[PDB]
């Protein structure tokens, strides 16, 4: 049952201009609030922002922001708080605060892999990384094969745009790619 989901949200200008960050937040809120009670008591969440002007994380890497540390239990209170943190970030950065031309997706991915591996150690827990981005070509990464050996975390990529990422996906087991258009069912 137990599971760990780490969210990575791309906050590049195209993500921030086309409401993809907004949409991602809305979706995270729906999903987290919709967890079963049993589930909240066994699972973990965390959130990292990639391509981000804020640099704060365990490895003190540029342009990666661990906006939510590993969190359990995933209670309603905890969820509302997490979503508020994402909301502040948007409100505070909706007026374009120096995120042009940033590429830190691979560094973010590696920080997460290191944070995860430290976090969980020898625990029997499903580990997962969910990635919200509209650029599957921006993943500065043969290298893939090193991850394919190191990462025991499956990767769910969410393409928010109407390759390196594809390669990495097929490399790691149980990985997948979805459109935003197929996350929930629109009613018509």
């Amino acid at each position: 049952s137990s599971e760990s989901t780490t969210f990575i949200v791309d906050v590049s200008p195209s993500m921030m201009k086309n409401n993809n960050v907004s949409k991602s937040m809305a979706y995270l809120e729906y999903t987290l609030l919709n967890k079963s009670k049993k589930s909240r008591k066994t699972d973990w969440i965390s959130c990292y922002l990639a391509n981000c002007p804020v640099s704060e994380n365990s490895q003190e890497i540029p342009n990666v922001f661990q906006i939510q540390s590993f969190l359990a239990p995933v209670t309603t209170t905890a969820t509302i708080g997490f979503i508020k943190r994402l909301k502040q970030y948007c409100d505070q950065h909706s007026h374009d605060s120096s995120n042009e031309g940033l590429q830190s997706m691979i560094q973010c991915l590696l920080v997460v892999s290191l944070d995860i591996k430290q976090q969980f150690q020898a625990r029997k827990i499903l580990k997962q990384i969910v990635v919200f981005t509209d650029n599957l070509d921006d993943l500065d990464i043969e290298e893939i094969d090193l991850l394919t050996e190191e990462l025991s975390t499956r990767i769910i990529l969410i393409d928010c745009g109407k390759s390196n990422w594809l390669k990495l996906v097929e490399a790691i087991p149980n990985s997948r790619i979805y459109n935003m258009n197929e996350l929930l069912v629109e009613i018509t």
Partner: peptide, 12 residues
Amino acid sequence: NSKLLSLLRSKT
């Protein structure tokens, strides 16, 4: 642990 860390220093 070690491989990941050098691979990240490589990227910084």
